[PDB]
Design an enzyme around this catalytic site. Structure first.
Site, short mmCIF file in Angstrom:
data_model
loop_
_atom_site.label_atom_id
_atom_site.label_comp_id
_atom_site.label_asym_id
_atom_site.label_seq_id
_atom_site.Cartn_x
_atom_site.Cartn_y
_atom_site.Cartn_z
N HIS A 238 -9.75 -6.11 4.69
CA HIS A 238 -10.04 -4.59 4.22
C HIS A 238 -9.11 -4.46 3.22
O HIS A 238 -7.85 -4.63 3.26
CB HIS A 238 -9.81 -3.62 5.25
CG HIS A 238 -10.16 -2.08 4.76
ND1 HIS A 238 -11.38 -1.83 4.78
CD2 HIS A 238 -9.30 -1.12 4.55
CE1 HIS A 238 -11.49 -0.60 4.18
NE2 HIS A 238 -10.19 -0.09 4.31
N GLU B 151 -13.57 -6.87 7.80
CA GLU B 151 -12.81 -5.43 7.47
C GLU B 151 -12.05 -4.83 8.66
O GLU B 151 -11.10 -4.06 8.67
CB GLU B 151 -13.99 -4.53 7.23
CG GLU B 151 -14.93 -4.67 6.04
CD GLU B 151 -14.48 -4.19 4.90
OE1 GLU B 151 -13.42 -3.77 4.86
OE2 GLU B 151 -15.02 -4.22 3.91
N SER C 291 -12.67 2.14 0.39
CA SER C 291 -12.06 2.49 1.86
C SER C 291 -12.51 4.09 1.50
O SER C 291 -13.58 4.57 1.30
CB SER C 291 -11.00 2.31 1.79
OG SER C 291 -10.33 2.84 3.24
N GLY D 218 -7.22 5.11 1.91
CA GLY D 218 -5.99 5.50 2.56
C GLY D 218 -6.31 6.48 3.76
O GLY D 218 -5.32 7.12 4.34
N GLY D 219 -7.67 6.50 4.07
CA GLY D 219 -7.95 7.24 5.12
C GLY D 219 -7.64 8.58 4.96
O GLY D 219 -7.26 9.52 5.70
N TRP E 247 0.90 -1.16 0.15
CA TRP E 247 0.01 0.15 0.03
C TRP E 247 0.77 1.34 0.21
O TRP E 247 0.23 2.26 -0.22
CB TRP E 247 -0.80 0.03 1.15
CG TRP E 247 -1.83 -1.33 1.32
CD1 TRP E 247 -1.63 -2.16 2.22
CD2 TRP E 247 -2.71 -1.39 0.24
NE1 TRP E 247 -2.72 -3.46 1.97
CE2 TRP E 247 -3.28 -2.83 0.84
CE3 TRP E 247 -3.34 -0.99 -0.93
CZ2 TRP E 247 -4.50 -3.52 0.20
CZ3 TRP E 247 -4.63 -1.56 -1.46
CH2 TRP E 247 -4.78 -2.92 -1.02
C1 6QS Z 1 -6.27 6.88 8.37
C2 6QS Z 1 -5.22 5.88 8.32
N1 6QS Z 1 -6.01 4.72 7.44
C3 6QS Z 1 -7.29 4.50 7.65
C4 6QS Z 1 -8.53 5.12 8.13
C5 6QS Z 1 -9.78 4.47 7.96
C6 6QS Z 1 -9.88 3.59 7.15
C7 6QS Z 1 -8.73 2.82 6.41
C8 6QS Z 1 -7.66 3.29 6.80
C9 6QS Z 1 -6.45 2.91 6.30
C10 6QS Z 1 -5.91 1.70 5.50
C11 6QS Z 1 -4.66 1.55 5.22
C12 6QS Z 1 -4.22 0.70 4.24
C13 6QS Z 1 -4.30 -0.70 5.00
C14 6QS Z 1 -3.65 -1.05 6.30
O1 6QS Z 1 -3.59 -2.02 6.63
O2 6QS Z 1 -3.23 0.21 7.01
C15 6QS Z 1 -3.20 0.33 8.41
C16 6QS Z 1 -3.13 1.80 8.58
C17 6QS Z 1 -3.47 2.08 10.13
C18 6QS Z 1 -2.46 3.21 10.35
C19 6QS Z 1 -1.70 3.26 9.14
O3 6QS Z 1 -1.89 2.28 8.35
C20 6QS Z 1 -5.30 -1.93 4.61
C21 6QS Z 1 -5.55 -2.92 5.52
N2 6QS Z 1 -6.04 -1.54 3.36
C22 6QS Z 1 -5.81 -0.55 2.66
C23 6QS Z 1 -5.17 0.38 2.98
C24 6QS Z 1 -4.81 1.70 2.12
O4 6QS Z 1 -4.13 2.54 2.54
C25 6QS Z 1 -5.55 1.27 0.62
C26 6QS Z 1 -6.95 0.84 0.76
C27 6QS Z 1 -6.60 -0.73 1.60
C28 6QS Z 1 -3.76 2.54 5.72
C29 6QS Z 1 -4.06 3.75 6.24
C30 6QS Z 1 -5.41 3.81 7.07
#
Ligand code: 6QS
Ligand code: 6QS
Ligand SMILES: *[C@@H]1O[C@H](CO)[C@@H](O[C@@H]2O[C@H](CO)[C@@H](O)[C@H](O)[C@H]2NC(C)=O)[C@H](O)[C@H]1NC(C)=O
Ligand SMILES: *[C@@H]1O[C@H](CO)[C@@H](O[C@@H]2O[C@H](CO)[C@@H](O)[C@H](O)[C@H]2NC(C)=O)[C@H](O)[C@H]1NC(C)=O
Ligand SMILES: *[C@@H]1O[C@H](CO)[C@@H](O[C@@H]2O[C@H](CO)[C@@H](O)[C@H](O)[C@H]2NC(C)=O)[C@H](O)[C@H]1NC(C)=O
Ligand code: NAG
Ligand code: NAG
Ligand code: NAG
Ligand code: NAG
Ligand code: NAG
Ligand code: NAG
Ligand code: NAG
Ligand code: NAG
Ligand code: NAG
Ligand code: NAG
Lengths: 526, 527
Positions: free
Chosen positions: A435, A322, A195, A113-114, A79
């Site tokens: 997710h 998710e 997302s 990517g939030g 990612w």
């Molecule tokens: C604001 C930070 N944030 C989110 C906030 C809400 C929902 C999803 C994410 C999210 C998703 C991702 C990424 C992610 C992950 O594992 O990251 C964990 C987060 C937590 C802290 C920093 O990274 C998955 C599984 N899939 C996906 C991610 C993506 O960025 C693309 C969409 C699919 C990265 C950051 C993310």
């Protein structure tokens, strides 16, 4: 390979895919670089070069923080951005089947990517397979993320908020004014995103400026009513004011705060975004969409209940697990490298981590709801519980509620429950169907037989690929062999949805009704 | 003639004809000195003797108590009102014996309910002659003091120590031990059964050392000491007896002087102030009830149950389908004996307001959320039914279940029943269903008398509750017959099998209302 755009001129390339050709154009500029004087401003329409843009490389990704909790681990690094980072990043991409069609439906991808991370150049967003197999044009854009995309001083043109959403919007205007040169049909456009991309898409259903710029919408694992999706104006400018004091940009009128922030090296913006909210959560969205009075007129949940949105078919859905992804980013007991059995009290500590501001009475009420075991022997009961809590509250219940309340206006909605775990997924098996891990299937990755998927995953991906094409072209996700099961419409009374895995394609009713009816009719009261 | 020589003197009884036979009955035998004058509020003093012949040929006086008066003329309400004169002179018992006279009959001893404030053994539905006739068992019942006369508590003070009504019951058990062999019963096969506060009394007798040798098995119908109404903590007991003193003009500082002041007070001034001693209170508030007195009860009952310090014997325990519906027409807004009582949603929580006066509003909303996951969200009755269930599950069902689990975990066989049949002659409206106390007719075999317009199904069902209760009494197993009755299985804490009772079909089921009781046992205490 040269196409005349309405303003400009681009050179693309022939990709050879599955025996044929897809012609693609990577990194077309769709807006002026938002640098120096334009940092934090709405994207400004481009002036006309002519010369020729070699649109033959993915463009720069927008400036963003990079997760490095697991160095050298595919599951987190896949990612991470894969092109250089610059504020010079407002570019988009176009895949077109060959030979060149004449009014071909187009799918515009919006990544998640939030609202803090993400880029269109990730391998799992490769548009060539869609274009090849289903003869659609695929377009995807880079929008600004983080404070560079969403810093809010409501009402001040500079820093108005929602700048990344306006980036998306401007790309949609680009496809309107130019896709017909490429052989696409501007009157047939489908947004799909995941997302935050899916929440973005749901916000384009409400913005009046976006109304004329597409036809249908596909929302994967996200919607604006998700708790992470929207920031109040009070939160948003406490956050920008703390970003100001963290950078030494504290001034007394807003304009001077803003130019102090514009003479700051981007890494001093980015590396301070993490501290603007005092009780983060693995899912905290530091700088997200706000009700700006421009893109969003009023607060989205009422615009949804009042019904002032674009009226079209939408396709919406979620994955089975998710929530598990975020449990390793700081829930005690949880690890990427063990089975993560937790006790009741490691459970409760995990809930504090995800529900920091909730009364102790409220956290125990959660626990009560998610502890009526069908098998109380089961060790990994609590693991599964906590993951399901995070996933339900953050994604599944908001998606169900969104399409529930969207459908009750004569619009047709289709809902899916994706339940297959990628055989080459690099995270542990206890995390399930994570997710983001349907995207490989929506983009036809497993169709590359050289690639290591399993014939089953290939057949499944071919199914999902043509269902979403057909939804884009027709407004109905039919599969047009009729081996396939037919997918019916979600309406509030019956609430039917379709299950996606390799074993079967079942049809089911009232998804997770008993879990979500807590998050809808009890939790908001704690 | 009809004469039995008891240790306290000889008594005379009555021939009764039952189904072409005779049970012989001795009604109103004194088992103690009348708790009069100096003896008010104290434990029962033993009888000495009479040299005359005491004819036990009428029911005796019921004990002083207040009376149900909301529905003049309604058999449904008045069927529970005392049917003899009221008097402090009320410590009397009844003995039904089969004829020909038995040689070692096992004995059923009945303890009545009425929230420790009302009740008496002379009601028509406690008539033991059918049991004697049909199962060849001695049935014995007794009057014990209820209300402040029975449970006024200054713990530690012999003048009013607490729990005298329970000591009344106990002294009647001692009478059965000392005397029943003269009537043909076996003092070493003696089963206590009782209902509501009577089943609570039975469970307390399992706890109390002084009762240990006085009985053998126990049957508990819709009652157990762990119900939220059954026991008052020591302090709170003494604070109500204090405020009673305040209302009658009996506030003294030498705490015994208070007891004298009340001992000169007229019984109905006491009864007349009993209700006010608790601020507010629900339709189920037990004004003066069992307490931790340090004599009958040495510790909080739940402690003793956990520690396993109770009698190790077999138990039969069960509940009714609609334990709560009765209490709704006694104060819930929008409920009446005479309309269908369809109510609204928070008419529903005016109802909870009434039954949970001390719970937070977050706690009441959580109770509501637990009971409003409708199978049919367009069903009018839904809220009404929920409220019944709420009052029922919290007050009777879930505690009965909980008591049986923890009792079961110490090695003795328990049996649990779900009583599910509505009396055709039930006088209350149908929406109230299988009400609290409306199993007692079937246990005492009134449907066997073919002259009171009962259904044949109801006769068969009463015959089997009767012989199962009697067999559990004699044998520790509520078998009906080996070969075409359903096995009644033991309640074990893992499976929690129970047997349902109604006219259509007796089935074995598991985990009676486990999803509700889960809420009461493991979320509500945290609220
Ligand atoms: C604001 C930070 N944030 C989110 C906030 C809400 C929902 C999803 C994410 C999210 C998703 C991702 C990424 C992610 C992950 O594992 O990251 C964990 C987060 C937590 C802290 C920093 O990274 C998955 C599984 N899939 C996906 C991610 C993506 O960025 C693309 C969409 C699919 C990265 C950051 C993310
Ligand atoms: C506090 C007074 N109280 C109780 C307290 C807890 C549990 C049951 C009762 C109870 C039961 C009864 C009687 C009753 C009833 O309807 O009474 C309503 C009371 C409550 C307030 C005013 O009148 C039924 C249905 N069945 C039975 C009753 C009894 O008398 C015991 C036999 C079964 C009488 C008083 C009672
Ligand atoms: C899974 O791995 C985690 C991480 O190594 C283990 O939890 C750690 O335990 C050490 C001490 O044993 C603590 O100092 C760490 O703070 C813990 N980390 C976390 C994230 O809790 C956990 O014990 C392992 N679980 C299993 C079932 O093996
Ligand atoms: C009446 O029944 C008892 C048993 O229920 C008879 O036997 C006594 O039972 C106890 C058990 O509690 C034994 O320990 C004794 O040894 C038994 N006694 C005898 C003499 O066998 C009792 O004898 C019976 N009495 C009559 C008159 O029938
Ligand atoms: C109910 O079960 C008991 C056994 O628990 C049956 O047997 C009676 O009790 C003991 C055996 O435990 C025998 O010594 C008795 O003689 C048995 N009773 C009779 C009358 O002989 C009992 O028979 C069963 N009840 C019915 C009605 O079948
Ligand atoms: C100005 C510029 O970048 N031009 C390049 C050109 O040099 C290159 O040879 C060709 C791709 O083969 O097209 C483009
Ligand atoms: C029917 C009958 O004879 N009953 C006797 C009665 O004669 C006797 O005088 C009375 C005194 O209490 O005791 C009883
Ligand atoms: C690109 O592909 C088309 C057909 O696939 C072909 O006709 C054309 O010559 C190719 N152009 C280049 C520059 O490779
Ligand atoms: C494109 O297709 C649409 C149908 O969606 C039609 O209305 C329009 O006339 C077509 N235009 C061209 C140039 O093919
Ligand atoms: C912003 O939020 C923090 C945490 O609640 C608080 O301490 C602070 O006073 C708020 N306002 C400003 C101006 O920072
Ligand atoms: C903001 O402050 C500077 C400091 O002198 C001033 O020049 C400017 O006019 C101010 N802007 C306002 C008051 O809108
Ligand atoms: C899907 O729908 C389109 C138009 O609605 C139709 O042309 C096609 O045959 C359908 N495919 C099926 C029903 O498999
Ligand atoms: C009592 O009943 C028996 C029959 O069980 C009879 O022989 C006897 O004469 C009767 N005595 C009286 C006083 O009724
Ligand atoms: C005892 O009763 C009095 C009545 O005046 C009341 O004020 C007090 O709070 C009561 N205490 C308890 C513990 O119920
Ligand atoms: C039922 O009767 C009571 C008593 O008169 C009354 O308060 C209530 O409103 C009635 N409800 C209905 C639905 O008739």
């Amino acid at each position: 390979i040269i196409i005349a755009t309405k303003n400009g001129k681009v050179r693309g390339m022939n990709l050879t895919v599955f025996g044929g050709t897809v012609t693609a154009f990577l990194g077309i500029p769709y807006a002026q670089p938002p640098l120096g004087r334009l940092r934090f401003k709405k994207p400004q329409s481009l002036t006309k070069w002519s010369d020729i843009w070699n649109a033959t490389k993915y463009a720069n990704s927008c400036c963003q923080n990079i997760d490095q909790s697991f160095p050298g681990f595919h599951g987190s690094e896949m990612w991470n951005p894969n092109t250089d980072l610059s504020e010079d990043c407002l570019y988009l991409n176009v895949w077109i089947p060959a030979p060149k069609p004449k009014n071909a439906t187009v799918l515009i991808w919006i990544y998640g990517g939030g609202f803090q991370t993400g880029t269109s150049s990730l391998h799992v967003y490769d548009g060539k397979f869609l274009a090849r197999v289903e003869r659609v044009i695929v377009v995807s854009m880079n929008y600004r993320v983080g404070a560079l995309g969403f810093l809010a001083l409501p009402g001040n043109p500079e820093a108005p908020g929602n700048m990344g959403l306006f980036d998306q919007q401007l790309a949609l205007q680009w496809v309107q004014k130019n896709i017909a040169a490429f052989g696409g049909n501007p009157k047939s456009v489908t947004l799909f995103g995941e997302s935050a991309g899916a929440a973005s898409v749901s916000l384009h259903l409400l913005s009046p400026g976006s109304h004329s710029l597409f036809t249908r919408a596909i929302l994967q694992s996200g919607s604006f009513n998700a708790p992470w999706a929207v920031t109040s104006l009070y939160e948003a400018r406490n956050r920008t004011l703390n970003l100001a004091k963290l950078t030494g940009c504290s001034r007394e009128n807003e304009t001077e705060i803003i130019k102090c922030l514009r003479n700051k090296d981007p890494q001093e913006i980015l590396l301070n975004e993490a501290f603007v909210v005092p009780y983060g959560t693995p899912l905290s969205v530091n700088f997200g969409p706000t009700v700006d009075g421009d893109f969003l007129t009023d607060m989205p949940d009422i615009l949804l209940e009042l019904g002032q949105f674009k009226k079209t078919q939408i396709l919406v859905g979620v994955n089975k697990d998710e929530g598990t992804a975020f449990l390793v980013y700081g829930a005690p007991g949880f690890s990427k490298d063990n089975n993560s059995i937790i006790t009741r009290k490691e459970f409760q500590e995990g809930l504090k981590i995800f529900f920091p501001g909730v009364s102790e009475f409220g956290k125990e009420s959660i626990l009560f709801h998610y502890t009526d075991w069908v098998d109380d022997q089961r060790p990994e009961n609590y693991r599964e519980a906590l993951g399901d809590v995070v996933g339900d509250y953050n994604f599944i219940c908001p998606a169900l509620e969104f399409t529930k309340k969207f459908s009750e206006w004569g619009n047709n909605a289709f809902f899916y429950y994706f339940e297959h775990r990628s055989s080459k997924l690099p995270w542990p098996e206890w995390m399930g169907v994570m997710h983001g891990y349907e995207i490989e299937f929506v983009f036809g990755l497993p169709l590359e037989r050289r690639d290591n998927y399993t014939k089953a995953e290939e057949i499944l991906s071919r199914s999902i690929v043509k269902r979403w094409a057909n939804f884009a072209k027709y407004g109905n996700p039919n599969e047009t062999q009729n081996n396939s099961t037919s997918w019916p419409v979600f309406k509030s009374t019956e609430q039917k949805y379709l299950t996606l895995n390799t074993e079967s394609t079942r049809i089911m009713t009232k998804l997770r009704a008993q879990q979500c009816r807590f998050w809808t009719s009890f939790f908001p009261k704690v």
